[PDB]
Amino acid sequence: VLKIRRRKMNHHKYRKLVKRTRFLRRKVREGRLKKKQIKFEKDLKRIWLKAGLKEAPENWQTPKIYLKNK
Amino acid sequence: KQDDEPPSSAFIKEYKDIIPNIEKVDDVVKRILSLEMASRKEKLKIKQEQLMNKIVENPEDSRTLEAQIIALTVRIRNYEEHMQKHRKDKAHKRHLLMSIDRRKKLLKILRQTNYDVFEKTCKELGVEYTLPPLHFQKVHRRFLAKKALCIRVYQEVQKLKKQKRALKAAAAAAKK
Amino acid sequence: IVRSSVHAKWVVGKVIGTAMIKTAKVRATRLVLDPYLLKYFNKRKTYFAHDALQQCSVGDIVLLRALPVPRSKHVKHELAEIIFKVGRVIDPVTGKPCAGTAYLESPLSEPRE
RNA sequence: ACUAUGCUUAGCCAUAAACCUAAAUAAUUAAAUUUAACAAAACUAUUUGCCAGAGAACUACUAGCCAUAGCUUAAAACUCAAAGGAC
RNA sequence: UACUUAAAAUUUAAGGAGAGGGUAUCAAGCACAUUAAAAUAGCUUAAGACACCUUGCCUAGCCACACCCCCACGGGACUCAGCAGUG
Ligand SMILES: [K+]
Ligand SMILES: [Mg+2]
Ligand SMILES: [Mg+2]
Ligand SMILES: [Mg+2]
Ligand SMILES: [Mg+2]
Ligand SMILES: [Mg+2]
Ligand SMILES: [Mg+2]
Ligand SMILES: [Mg+2]
Ligand SMILES: [Mg+2]
Ligand SMILES: [Mg+2]
Ligand SMILES: [Mg+2]
Ligand SMILES: [Mg+2]
Residue B79: other Cβ atoms inside 10 A? 20
Handedness of CA C85, C86, C88, C92 (dihedral sign): positive
For C104, name the nearest residue in chain B, comparing CA atoms only: B114
Question: What string of DSSP letters covers C13-81?
Answer: EEEEEEEETTEEEEEEEEEEEETTTTEEEEEEEEEEEE-TT----TT-EEEEEE-SS-SSSSEEEEEEE
Residue B34's SS3 state is: strand
> Considering only CA atoms, which of B109, B108, B111 is closest in space to residue C85?
B111
Q: Give the C-alpha separation, B60 to A64, whole Å.
A: 61
* Residue A11 CA distance to nucleotide D85 C1' (Å): 25
Nucleotides of D under 7 A from a protein CB: 10-11, 55-59, 61-70, 84-85
* Residue C31 CA distance to nucleotide E23 C1' (Å): 29
* Residue A49 CA distance to nucleotide E78 C1' (Å): 39
Residue C83's SS3 state is: strand
> Considering only CA atoms, which of B11, B14, B34, B120 is closest in space to residue B70?
B120
Taking CB atoms and an 8 Å limit, are B145 and A63 in contact across chains?
A: yes
Q: Give the C-alpha separation, C56 to B86, whole Å.
A: 45
Taking CB atoms and an 8 Å limit, are B112 and C16 in contact across chains?
A: no
User: Mind telling me how many Å the CA of B118 is from chain C's nearest CA?
Assistant: 9
Q: How far is residue C75 CA from its own chain's centroid? A: 15
Q: Please state whether at least 3 CB pairs lie below 8 Å between chains C and B.
A: yes
> Considering only CA atoms, which of C5, C47, C59, C41 is closest in space to residue C23?
C47
| Residue C67 to residues B77, B91, C48, Cα–Cα distance (Å) | 51, 57, 11
Taking CB atoms and an 8 Å limit, are B115 and C87 in contact across chains?
A: yes
All residues at 6 or more sequence positions from B134 whose CB lies less than 8 Å from its CB, including other chains: C16, C17
